Amino acid sequence: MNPIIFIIILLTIMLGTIIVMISSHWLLVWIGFEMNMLAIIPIMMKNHNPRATEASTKYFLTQSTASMLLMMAVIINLMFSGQWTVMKLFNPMASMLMTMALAMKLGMAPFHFWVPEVTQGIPLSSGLILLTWQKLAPMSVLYQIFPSINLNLILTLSVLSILIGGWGGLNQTQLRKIMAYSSIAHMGWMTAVLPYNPTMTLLNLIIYIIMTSTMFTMFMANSTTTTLSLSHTWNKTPIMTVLILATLLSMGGLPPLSGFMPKWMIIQEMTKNNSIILPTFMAITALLNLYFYMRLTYSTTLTMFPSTNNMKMKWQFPLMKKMTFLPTMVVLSTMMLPLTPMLSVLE
């Protein structure tokens, strides 16, 4: 891709999302998703291999199907209310369709199957956009329609995603599949608290994006996409292994790291609503995530795996990748817990 075309396509990915977030009319929300999907496909295809083509096709079919269901919900809503304002829906069937559509876009279980496959098939930089920026637009719509969402439906989706994400990651050696299953588990946390306090949905989304961007950037720095490729990092850049370790522990939700902040706040809001069984089950199930995060730390930072002779050549050259914002992201990914009361800026 010509660099100017890459920039223009990225600006259109961003503009599509922004249109969704600033729209008050359901038609423009739909347009925002269509424009965003139009621009994302080329960055998935940019490496021209059969795996990228399959990933783009599977992605296109999922998102096109979801947007058709969203339009259906919008039109049903128009029929029973005669208006297009982006807000609570005025018909329960419209609400189910819209909620299901946004679940498909988010990749929440049981609509999750595409996320590990699409993430595996596209470059790391494309995967970083897919698992972070792309969550913004569906989340901002859920933020606005939640008063009309079926509580059983949304909590059922949250519970399934937490379980499926946790179990799915145990069997993965590919880093892009691990991140994909980690994303599904975290989406579950975000939507479990949405009915109770939307602000905690935003907090969990922001912290999740920061930690995921840190992980993906750190994988891009060394061009690692497998567990064993990442196990050579200790013999090239020892500092990176420490940053990976800290970020992974934070993603596991361990105190006193930043990633504990959202699980802590989400548990609080649910208990204030006399929801005790569900936060307890979610917190225990999240230990599945901590397990395969800790497995990665074992092969990356806490032990030294076998190396190869040709690694000695890599010692003589510096890291020339950009690693934009990485030092800032890793600090926020780990050291933010003492600033937890700052979450009120999201209120």
Partner: peptide
């Protein structure tokens, strides 16, 4: 238990 459930979740065929 978790190892068995993981295989159930992830042993998929990749078919659209």
């Amino acid at each position: 238990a978790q190892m068995k459930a993981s295989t159930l979740v992830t042993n998929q065929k990749g078919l659209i």
